[PDB]
Amino acid sequence: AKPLSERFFIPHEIKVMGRWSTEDVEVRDPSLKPYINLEPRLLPHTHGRHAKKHFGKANVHIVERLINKIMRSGGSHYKVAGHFMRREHRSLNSKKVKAYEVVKEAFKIIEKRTGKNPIQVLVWAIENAAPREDTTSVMFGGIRYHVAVDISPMRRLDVALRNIALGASAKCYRTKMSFAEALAEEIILAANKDPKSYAYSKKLEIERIAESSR
Amino acid sequence: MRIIQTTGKRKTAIARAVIREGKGRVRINGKPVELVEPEIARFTILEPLILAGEEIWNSVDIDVKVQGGGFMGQAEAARIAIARALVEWTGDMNLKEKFIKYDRTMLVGDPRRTEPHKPNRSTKGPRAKRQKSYR
Amino acid sequence: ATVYDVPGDLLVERVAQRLKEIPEIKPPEWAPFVKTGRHKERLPEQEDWWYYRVASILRRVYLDGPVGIERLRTYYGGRKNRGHAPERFYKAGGSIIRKALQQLEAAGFVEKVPGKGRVITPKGRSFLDKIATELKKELEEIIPELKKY
Amino acid sequence: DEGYPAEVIEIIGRTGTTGDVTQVKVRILEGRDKGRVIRRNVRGPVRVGDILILRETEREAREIK
Amino acid sequence: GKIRQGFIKRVARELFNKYPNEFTRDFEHNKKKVEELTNVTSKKIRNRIAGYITKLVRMKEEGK
RNA sequence: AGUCCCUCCCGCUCGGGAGGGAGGCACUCUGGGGGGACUGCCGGCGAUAAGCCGGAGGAAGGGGCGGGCGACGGUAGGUCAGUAUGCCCCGAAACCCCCGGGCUACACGCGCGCUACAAUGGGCGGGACAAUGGGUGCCGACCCCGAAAGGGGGAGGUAAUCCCCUAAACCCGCCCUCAGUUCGGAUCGCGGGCUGCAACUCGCCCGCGUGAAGCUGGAAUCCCUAGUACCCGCGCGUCAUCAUCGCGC
RNA sequence: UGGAGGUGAUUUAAAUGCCAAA
Ligand SMILES: [Mg+2]
Ligand SMILES: [Mg+2]
Ligand SMILES: [Mg+2]
Ligand SMILES: [Mg+2]
Ligand SMILES: [Mg+2]
Ligand SMILES: [Mg+2]
Ligand SMILES: [Mg+2]
Ligand SMILES: [Mg+2]
Ligand SMILES: [Mg+2]
Ligand SMILES: [Mg+2]
Ligand SMILES: [Mg+2]
């Protein structure tokens, strides 16, 4: 099936998964620039040494962040697109090899369909899916009200990554699409500001509700 | 006729590496490193060699014996042992700082170990507990 | 080149193909109707699974010998689905392994060490190493780093 | 339309119903009111040198103690 | 919190008054000296005492 | 691991492997003793004190990390059905034995779990890598017979020596393509075994057949801050036989 | 240090005490 040149692939340079270089990738958003890490690195697996220290997740390569984000079940205690998604024994919890394979196949599909460097497309997606205004809640007279506030860049990045992963998770659930295809579809749609993307629609709704409560 | 031996540990896996002058063959428990599977484990072992460069890579031979642990734990111990062997054999300080910039753990190791379990659902973990009911 | 230089599964496939020319390897009469263990669910789907099992057993004896029936029964077991109960490990049965080892001895590839098990004779070692050398010659045409080994 | 970047220069303190909000002082980097210093409410972790994107620059948060 | 213990302070102050010209601003020297001038048998307590004595020496050398 | 002798393999052997013997304690390991971290060094805040915040160096940094040890008392909290013990009772039955039943019943309400509702999969063949513990009323390699569950002989072991003991999740190839299905495996028929003095009431295992509800779950509500939570198997206790449990790995 | 006065305000709903003790 898969050719032997792919089963036994050997790199010779420090580049992401030995296949794509990140030298020409640039970040437009001035706020997200010092939080998207793009230093050269061969293997995106750092064995969770960053969770101890405050702000330590800043210096973690963005591909590894995506891999960690999709390594989940998806819909445990809140509904996504109108449903709980409890996979349990058939989820991706603590299976980081399978997540690595999913991300690799998604990158190959992205490169085939659009002809561009997949890291660049991913950066565009997270730029378009990062909200700029959020809201907090107050209670009065037994009724709950919203008040608009601003968002720090780290939280923007976290929310964008989680929403992309959730959209991909919802698109392949009990349908003929596969996980890698859904992830590719979601990233491409978010990169083109298409409302059919879950992440972009979520960002629009969040910002609209925040605006209507200044 | 130089010989150097080094040791690496990672959560119950122990690796012993021997380095000598050679033509560039690296073996893990007698298997060529190019055939190690899965891929995510093959790249764990090869990182220090790529960082060192092809000139140093092709002038040595390394044999690694590793036991205990799991497939991911065994690869990381071998990586630690190989990095220490490379820095000791050539004895150049530009490389030692280069390893530290990329990944400190290559040279100082990882001290984490499992935490022993405690009662109230002891088989699941030290902190996971049984579901609580009031009626 | 030796067995240690090539992937296991590819070698097993080549050896299984090669074992069909040796007259002493013939699947028994009850081969069409059996599962390969109590932990399985359905019968084997390959019409020539016997040769695959024999090739695997021969490679096993080459690497871990001397070895007996019981340890091989451990090696060919696995996890079982038990309805509403949690899954569990079980061993395989013994007839397939015993008959395969006897046929391999009849062909002269293994011999018996008393109280210890079965070991690979020089003929069997040559037989496996020849196929390993040929497979490596094929393989290094697309992985140039394999030429050093 | 694309907002205005501002830069955090001082942390004042936590607030909100559950302590989830921080009050900061920012200096506008772009637009009509470049250079002005105003205080704002931020959600999420923040440190000196972060850059916020404001959708409007004429609202100022009520000072906390 | 790293609050120094009472008996550590008491023994350290007794040592400082009795042998004023015996301790310097160096931690190793004081470690050995305390090890020899008392019957303390725990390695940890010895380190605490030596550290406090070092602080006393630097504080009196400043003149408070 | 290096050095030496013999034997056997491959590309016929310059080279590369595997066993055995001499030989060594290098490396891993085992376990006695010792070293190492003290807010000790540096810059701020606080009072110039107690301390706090941030840096270097470091295997480790600020109770270094995880455990044992629970003050004076209260709860008329639980236990006389573990043992000790006052009073009241039975004292030819409320004491001591034996046989057969029951604690396993079944319109229904509730707690804690396991298996699922599928592709972040099901099946078939092949390839990988553990740790804790336990063994003489016992652990049993190795050979033979049987399709399986099992049956007949039986080395070594009172154990860093012999045995339980070549884990599963994971990886590679082929079949199935969104369906109450090659998802699920409850219920029942027939046949074969083991333990035991005894298997119907009322045990556990294997083969062929059979093929229920279930297509993600209202109002509510639980656990968890790092080698932690989730996911995956294994050991011991109980034990003649029996683990969807307890304590650990 | 400890007291005495004055003017302003104070973000929905939320009733009850049974077996016991004897
Ligand atoms: Mg655990
Ligand atoms: Mg298997
Ligand atoms: Mg299952
Ligand atoms: Mg009481
Ligand atoms: Mg009471
Ligand atoms: Mg009962
Ligand atoms: Mg099925
Ligand atoms: Mg019965
Ligand atoms: Mg369905
Ligand atoms: Mg019980
Ligand atoms: Mg009342």
Short mmCIF file of C-alpha atoms in Angstrom, two decimals, chain B:
data_model
loop_
_atom_site.label_atom_id
_atom_site.label_comp_id
_atom_site.label_asym_id
_atom_site.label_seq_id
_atom_site.Cartn_x
_atom_site.Cartn_y
_atom_site.Cartn_z
CA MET B 1 41.85 1.79 19.82
CA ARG B 2 39.55 4.06 21.81
CA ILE B 3 36.35 2.78 23.40
CA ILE B 4 33.81 4.89 25.28
CA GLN B 5 30.76 3.69 27.22
CA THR B 6 27.76 5.75 28.34
CA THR B 7 24.46 5.23 30.16
CA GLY B 8 20.94 6.60 29.85
CA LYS B 9 17.83 6.18 31.98
CA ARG B 10 14.18 7.05 31.40
CA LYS B 11 11.33 5.70 33.59
CA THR B 12 12.61 2.10 34.18
CA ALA B 13 14.39 1.77 30.82
CA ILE B 14 18.18 1.49 30.92
CA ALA B 15 20.50 1.89 27.92
CA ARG B 16 24.24 1.19 27.64
CA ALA B 17 26.04 2.57 24.59
CA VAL B 18 29.53 1.85 23.25
CA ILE B 19 31.22 4.15 20.73
CA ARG B 20 34.34 3.52 18.66
CA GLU B 21 35.92 4.48 15.35
CA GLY B 22 33.92 3.21 12.39
CA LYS B 23 32.11 3.85 9.12
CA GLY B 24 28.75 5.10 10.39
CA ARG B 25 26.70 2.08 11.52
CA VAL B 26 24.30 2.50 14.45
CA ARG B 27 22.47 -0.52 15.88
CA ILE B 28 19.80 -0.80 18.57
CA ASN B 29 19.75 -4.29 20.10
CA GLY B 30 21.34 -5.56 16.90
CA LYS B 31 18.89 -3.92 14.50
CA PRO B 32 19.90 -1.13 12.09
CA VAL B 33 18.48 2.17 13.27
CA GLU B 34 16.92 2.85 9.86
CA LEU B 35 14.38 0.05 10.43
CA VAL B 36 13.14 1.07 13.89
CA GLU B 37 9.36 1.43 14.05
CA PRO B 38 7.11 3.32 14.47
CA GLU B 39 8.32 6.52 12.84
CA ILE B 40 7.82 8.67 15.94
CA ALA B 41 10.33 6.45 17.73
CA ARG B 42 12.86 6.49 14.89
CA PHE B 43 13.08 10.29 14.92
CA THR B 44 13.64 10.33 18.68
CA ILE B 45 16.89 8.39 18.29
CA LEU B 46 18.18 10.20 15.19
CA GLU B 47 18.01 13.79 16.47
CA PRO B 48 21.49 14.08 18.07
CA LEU B 49 23.11 12.48 15.03
CA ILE B 50 21.48 15.00 12.69
CA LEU B 51 22.41 17.87 14.99
CA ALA B 52 26.03 16.71 15.08
CA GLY B 53 26.28 16.59 11.29
CA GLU B 54 27.23 14.10 8.62
CA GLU B 55 31.00 14.53 8.97
CA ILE B 56 30.95 13.32 12.57
CA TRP B 57 28.17 10.84 11.84
CA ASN B 58 30.10 8.84 9.24
CA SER B 59 33.31 8.51 11.29
CA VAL B 60 31.99 6.45 14.24
CA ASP B 61 30.12 3.24 15.04
CA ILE B 62 27.66 2.93 17.93
CA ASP B 63 26.09 -0.14 19.51
CA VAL B 64 23.30 0.30 22.07
CA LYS B 65 21.82 -2.31 24.42
CA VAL B 66 18.59 -1.22 26.10
CA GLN B 67 16.20 -3.06 28.41
CA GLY B 68 13.09 -2.37 30.45
CA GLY B 69 10.38 0.19 29.94
CA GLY B 70 8.31 0.62 26.80
CA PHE B 71 8.89 1.45 23.15
CA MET B 72 8.85 5.21 23.73
CA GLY B 73 10.77 4.96 26.99
CA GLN B 74 13.48 2.86 25.35
CA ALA B 75 14.00 5.29 22.47
CA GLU B 76 14.53 8.26 24.77
CA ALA B 77 17.08 6.47 26.95
CA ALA B 78 19.01 5.51 23.82
CA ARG B 79 18.89 9.13 22.66
CA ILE B 80 20.35 10.29 25.99
CA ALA B 81 23.13 7.71 25.84
CA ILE B 82 24.02 8.56 22.25
CA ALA B 83 24.16 12.29 22.96
CA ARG B 84 26.45 11.80 25.95
CA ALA B 85 28.70 9.50 23.93
CA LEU B 86 28.95 12.02 21.10
CA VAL B 87 29.92 14.90 23.37
CA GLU B 88 32.49 12.82 25.24
CA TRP B 89 34.11 11.27 22.16
CA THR B 90 34.80 14.45 20.19
CA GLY B 91 35.22 16.71 23.23
CA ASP B 92 34.21 19.94 21.49
CA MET B 93 32.30 22.57 23.41
CA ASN B 94 30.48 24.14 20.47
CA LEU B 95 28.46 20.95 20.09
CA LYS B 96 27.68 20.70 23.81
CA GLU B 97 26.07 24.13 23.84
CA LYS B 98 24.23 23.29 20.62
CA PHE B 99 22.60 20.26 22.25
CA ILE B 100 21.58 22.36 25.25
CA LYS B 101 19.98 25.05 23.09
CA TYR B 102 17.86 22.47 21.27
CA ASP B 103 16.94 20.23 24.22
CA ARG B 104 18.47 20.37 27.69
CA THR B 105 17.16 16.93 28.67
CA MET B 106 19.57 15.31 26.20
CA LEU B 107 22.37 15.83 28.71
CA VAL B 108 20.82 16.13 32.19
CA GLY B 109 18.19 13.41 31.93
CA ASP B 110 14.62 13.23 33.16
CA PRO B 111 14.00 12.47 36.86
CA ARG B 112 10.23 11.84 36.72
CA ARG B 113 8.84 8.53 38.01
CA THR B 114 5.36 7.20 38.72
CA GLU B 115 3.57 8.18 41.91
CA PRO B 116 2.41 5.27 44.12
CA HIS B 117 -1.32 4.59 44.36
CA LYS B 118 -3.51 5.22 47.41
CA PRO B 119 -6.80 3.75 48.70
CA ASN B 120 -10.26 4.75 47.51
CA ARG B 121 -10.07 3.22 44.01
CA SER B 122 -6.43 2.27 44.41
CA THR B 123 -6.19 0.46 41.08
CA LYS B 124 -6.86 3.57 38.99
CA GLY B 125 -4.45 6.09 40.43
CA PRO B 126 -3.14 8.00 43.42
CA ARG B 127 -5.75 10.76 43.00
CA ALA B 128 -8.69 9.33 41.05
CA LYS B 129 -11.57 8.45 43.37
CA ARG B 130 -14.96 6.77 43.43
CA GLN B 131 -18.11 8.65 42.46
CA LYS B 132 -19.82 10.19 45.48
CA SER B 133 -23.55 9.95 46.16
CA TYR B 134 -25.74 11.55 48.80
CA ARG B 135 -29.10 9.82 48.33
#
